[PDB]
DNA sequence: TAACTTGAAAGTATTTCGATTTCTTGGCTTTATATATCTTGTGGAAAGCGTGCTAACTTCGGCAGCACATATACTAA
DNA sequence: TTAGTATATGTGCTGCCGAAGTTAGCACGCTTTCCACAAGATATATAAAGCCAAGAAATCGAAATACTTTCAAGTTA
RNA sequence: UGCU
């Protein structure tokens, strides 16, 4: 009921956090959700991608320089959010979020944006390292989503003229993600 | 249930917010732990003019709050030398208390 | 009182958390000789999973049922041949083969 | 007054090695239909402390109690 | 029988603190059980893809040696 | 809360 009320107003709220704060398991949660929606028949608006993207980007602490995170990892909020929105729109238009969990794709997109905003100092940083630094539970398929998005970006590079001559890869296309 | 209970699931985040909001808006403060029931603590800032706002910001209300026309606290005592303005006082029923 | 018996955990970010949906099952795969002796046990007993689970101590009855369903869905001719062939129930030699399988998995772990 | 054969002195390069990533496996989730049965998941209706201040006038305005006085009935001479 | 004395007789006095009631003129504004009815928990395809954790292979990172350069001091001249 |  809380989830339906949250959806009816186009408000993003993750069923994972709902279950975490509800003292329940995802299996029975989904089972009873399907049962109650089939019994009632209420309108279930789809979870908008941009709202969830903003909600999850507000979680990361790379906006204000805290004691743990040095200043090099701190990046701009507006530009990084816009980059993540463009990346997740690309993912939604390239058939990457359909059928798969959206939050792993959001994580991969924000990670790629954080790496592209400064590829030099972040060429060695890994997904697990970024998750540890940001204090966020690393999603399992986030790695696969990242690998697929990087393949799509390599295809876009091959389509482009100068990049296909440069012959970049899944590690060197991060600096030109912006141009893509 | 065997599911271990924790406070995070009932930590009310709106209790203090609503309490402060009401105490500042309504102006009535009811502290039961101290048995203090005060009214008129907060007042709307008069934006009639900059002078009006600057003078209302530095007002002082009394504990009496127009209980009796005692005239004692309403009179100007010599103890107000250099501390409070002798001449500045609202003209009306609140003469001497504000 | 807890005399430094446990350690604090820096988990549960107040921001948000996601779901898992996969908690416990985490089965373990079979092998060639194990599949052979499993088909032998099928030919020897039938489809009753209770006896199969009782005679298999190290593999779970749910895993046995999953394997049988997978065989029924993929290799039907093998199940047909297994039901065609029959063997009288052996107990002592079956325990000897169980000990042999234990030794084989021990050697595997050593490798 | 140069020229070539010295020496330990750099980068600098490549080759393997620790390690983390990527790639494979199952197996469960879910979709409908009904087929059928044990104890234990609930619905729902009952019912067996603790303060402070007076906000001050007026003029009650009664009764509490009390309590003082005494008129009378009992008792000693 | 009569004067002196004790009692209650209602009466009338005092304070007793409290009782009702007052204060002038506009515009703004929880527990036990008990209980009964229906809902876990159960086999079973079943196509389908996404997910979440062991293993096996791969390549990145870089560290300990192998080449070349470079001086600098010393040789045949 | 201001006004007389
Ligand atoms: N503008 C305005 N503000 C008021 C008025 N009455 C009350 N206020 C606000 O309330 C406080 C004092 O009002 P009070 O006289 O205590 O309110 P009140 O005692 O209920 O007055 P009544 O309603 O006549 O009993 C002031 O200090 C103001 O904060 C009013 O009549 N007009």
Which one, of C56, B34, C19, lies nearest residue A29 by Cα? C19
Q: Which of residues 62-101 of A touch C (CB under 8 A)?
A: none
Q: Which among C11, C18, C25, C26 is the top mutation candidate for probing chain A, defined by the most A β-carbons within 10 Å of its own β-carbon?
A: C18
Q: Please, which residues have CB within 8 angstroms of residue B73's CB and are 6 or more apart in sequence?
A: B62, B64, B96, B97
Among A18, A23, A28, the strongest candidate for a mutation testing the B interface, having the largest count of B CBs within 10 A, is A23
Is the Cβ atom of B90 under 6 angstroms away from ligand 1?
A: no
Amino acid A81 CA to nucleotide E76 C1' distance, rounded Å: 77
Ligand 1 touching residue B22 (CB < 6 A): no
CB pairs under 8 A between A and C: 33
Segments in A9-138 forming alpha helices (H): 15-22, 26-40, 49-57, 77-93, 102-116, 127-134
CB atoms within 10 A of CB A26: 19
User: Taking Cα atoms as reference points, which of A37, A1, A16 lies closest to residue C21?
Assistant: A16
Inter-chain contact A26–C19, Cβ cutoff 8 Å? yes
Q: Exposed, middle or buried, A90 (CB in 10 Å: 0-12/13-18/19+)?
A: middle
Q: What angle do CA B51, B53, B56 make, to 5 degrees?
A: 105
As a whole number of angstroms, the distance between CA A92 and CA A84 comes to 12
Taking a C-beta distance cutoff of 8 angstroms, is the pair C51, A51 a contact? Answer: no
- As a dihedral over the C-alpha atoms of residue A79, residue A80, residue A82, residue A83, rounded to 10 degrees, the angle is 120
Q: How many residues does chain A have?
A: 180
Query: Contact, A150 vs A173, CB < 8 A?
Result: yes
Two tokens at C74?
């993929």
Q: Is B2 on the interface with A (CB under 8 A)?
A: no
Note whether C63 and C27 are within 8 A (CB): yes
Q: How far is residue A134's CA from residue A81's CA, in Å, rounded to a whole number?
A: 15
- Angstrom distance (rounded) from CA B30 to CA B37: 5
| Beta-ladder partners of A38 | none
Six-digit token string for A148? 């697929």
Residues B73/B62, Cβ–Cβ less than 8 Å: yes
A22 half-sphere exposure, CB direction, 13 A CA radius: 17
- Could you count the other beta carbons within 10 Å of the beta carbon of residue A117? 17
Q: Which residues pair with residue B38 across a beta bridge?
A: B29
Which ligand 1 atom sits nearest the alpha carbon of residue B94?
27
B43 lines ligand 1 (CB under 6 A): yes
Q: How many other CB atoms sit within 10 Å of the CB of residue A163?
A: 19
Distance CA B48, CA B57 (A): 13
Q: What are phi and psi of A94, to 5 degrees?
A: -100, 15
Between chains, do A21 and B3 touch, taking CB under 8 Å as contact? Answer: no
Backbone angles phi, psi at A140, to 5 degrees: -70, -60
Give yes or no for CB of A9 within 7 Å of strand D. Answer: no
CA distance linking residue C71 with residue C80, whole number of Å: 11
Q: Whose CA is nearest to atom 19 of ligand 1?
A: B66
Torsion of CA C95, C96, C102, C107, to 10 degrees: -170
Within 8 A by CB and 6+ apart from A177, the residues are A87, A112, A113, A116, A153
What is the distance between the alpha carbons of residues B48 and C106, in angstroms, rounded to a whole number? 91
Nearest nucleotide to A150 (CA to C1') is D22
Question: What experiment produced this structure?
Answer: cryo-EM
* DSSP character string of C8-54: ------SS--------S-------HHHHHHHHHHHHHH-S-HHHHHH
Q: Which residues pair with B29 in a beta bridge?
A: B38
Q: How far is CA C13 from CA A29, A135, A139, A177, B62, in A?
A: 22, 7, 14, 30, 49
């Amino acid at each position: 009921c809380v989830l339906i009320t949250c959806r009816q107003h186009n408000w993003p709220l993750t069923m994972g956090a709902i279950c975490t704060l509800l003292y329940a398991d995802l299996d029975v949660f989904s089972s009873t959700y399907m049962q109650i929606v089939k019994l009632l028949g209420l309108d279930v608006p789809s979870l908008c991608l941009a709202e969830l993207v903003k909600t999850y980007c507000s979680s990361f602490k790379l906006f204000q320089a805290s004691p743990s995170v040095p200043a090099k990892y701190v990046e701009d909020k507006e530009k990084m959010l816009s980059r993540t929105m463009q990346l997740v729109e690309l993912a939604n238009e390239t058939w990457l979020v359909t059928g798969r969990h959206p939050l792993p794709v959001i994580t991969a997109a924000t990670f790629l944006a954080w790496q592209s905003l400064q590829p030099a100092d972040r060429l060695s940083c890994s997904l697990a390292r970024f998750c540890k630094l940001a204090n966020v539970d690393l999603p399992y398929p986030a790695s696969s989503r990242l690998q697929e998005l990087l393949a799509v970006l390599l295809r876009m590079a091959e389509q482009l003229a100068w990049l296909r001559v440069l012959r970049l890869d899944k590690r060197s296309v991060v600096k030109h993600i912006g141009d893509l | 249930r065997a599911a271990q209970f924790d406070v995070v699931k009932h930590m009310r985040q709106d209790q203090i917010t609503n309490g402060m909001v009401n105490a500042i808006s309504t102006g009535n403060w009811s502290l039961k732990r101290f048995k203090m029931d005060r009214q008129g603590v907060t007042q709307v800032l008069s934006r009639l003019s900059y002078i009006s706002a600057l003078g209302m910001m530095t007002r002082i209300s009394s504990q009496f709050e127009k209980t009796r026309k005692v005239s004692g606290p309403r009179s100007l005592q010599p103890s107000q030398w250099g501390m409070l303005c002798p001449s500045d006082t609202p003209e009306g029923e609140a003469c001497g208390l504000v | 009182c807890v005399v430094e018996e446990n350690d604090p955990i820096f988990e549960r970010g107040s921001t948000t958390t996601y779901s898992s949906f996969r908690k416990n099952y985490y089965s373990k795969p079979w092998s060639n000789k194990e599949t052979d002796m499993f088909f032998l046990a099928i030919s020897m007993v039938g489809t009753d999973f209770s006896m199969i689970g009782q005679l298999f101590p190290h593999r779970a009855r749910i895993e046995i049922k999953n394997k049988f369903k997978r065989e029924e869905k993929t290799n039907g001719w093998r199940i047909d041949k297994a039901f065609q062939e029959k063997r009288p129930f052996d107990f002592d030699f079956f325990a000897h083969l169980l000990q042999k399988v234990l030794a084989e998995e021990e050697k595997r772990k050593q490798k």
